[PDB]
Amino acid sequence: KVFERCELARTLKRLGMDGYRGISLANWMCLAKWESGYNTRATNYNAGDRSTDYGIFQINSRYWCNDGKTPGAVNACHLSCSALLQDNIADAVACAKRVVRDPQGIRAWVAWRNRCQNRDVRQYVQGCGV
Ligand SMILES: *[C@@H]1O[C@H](CO)[C@@H](O[C@@H]2O[C@H](CO)[C@H](O)[C@H](O)[C@H]2O)[C@H](O)[C@H]1NC(C)=O
Ligand SMILES: *[C@@H]1O[C@H](CO)[C@@H](O[C@@H]2O[C@H](CO)[C@H](O)[C@H](O)[C@H]2O)[C@H](O)[C@H]1NC(C)=O
């Protein structure tokens, strides 16, 4: 489904995203908005490296989840990319959390760098009571 800004702010809050390894809730809100527009069913296919980005945080099938058709997939999140298209984002979160424990951290999402990095994200969580 498509969350509404403030439903997602509180929901991630409950899942422990605020301050998770130094990443403020607002930063996550920003990359979720630009990567998927708050949609858990979002899916983007890269014809070149035959990989697919899934769900709300647009996590890659070559490095994180398994869809059984991406050449050279390692499945670091030990998850089915399917888990990334269901309405409950519990596993989407458990995985984005694994993603940031890599050397590059939040730099793993280009939308973050383009529209979130150095563009003050205090705007996304203000009014949600988080
Ligand atoms: C987006 O794709 C990136 C490359 O396709 C990916 O970055 C790579 O992730 C690797 C994970 O084992 C490793 O950290 C490499 O150093 C890095 O280049 C990035 O993680 C992907 N982002 C998402 C959200 O899936
Ligand atoms: C999605 O974002 C990823 C990081 O924001 C990006 O992957 C990174 O690309 C770097 C290139 O200098 C380097 O290889 C990093 O190790 C890697 O994680 C990925 O390319 C972005 N998606 C697209 C389609 O560009």
Swiss-Prot record:
Gene3D superfamilies: 1.10.530.10. Keywords: Amyloid, Amyloidosis, Antimicrobial, Bacteriolytic enzyme, Disease variant, Disulfide bond, Glycosidase, Hydrolase, Secreted, Signal. Pfam families: Lys. GO terms for biological process: antimicrobial humoral response; defense response to bacterium; defense response to Gram-negative bacterium; defense response to Gram-positive bacterium; inflammatory response; killing of cells of another organism. It is found in: Secreted. It comes from the Eukaryota. Disulfide bonds join 6-128, 30-116, 65-81, 77-95. Its EC number is 3.2.1.17. It catalyses: Hydrolysis of (1->4)-beta-linkages between N-acetylmuramic acid and N-acetyl-D-glucosamine residues in a peptidoglycan and between N-acetyl-D-glucosamine residues in chitodextrins. One of its GO terms (cellular component) is extracellular space. Residues 1-130 form the C-type lysozyme domain. It is linked to Amyloidosis, hereditary systemic 5: A form of hereditary systemic amyloidosis, a disorder characterized by amyloid deposition in multiple tissues resulting in a wide clinical spectrum. AMYLD5 primarily affects the viscera, and the predominant clinical features are renal dysfunction of varying severity, and intra-abdominal bleeding. Inheritance is autosomal dominant. Monomer. Lysozyme C is capable of both hydrolysis and transglycosylation; it also shows a slight esterase activity. It acts rapidly on both peptide-substituted and unsubstituted peptidoglycan, and slowly on chitin oligosaccharides. This is Lysozyme C.
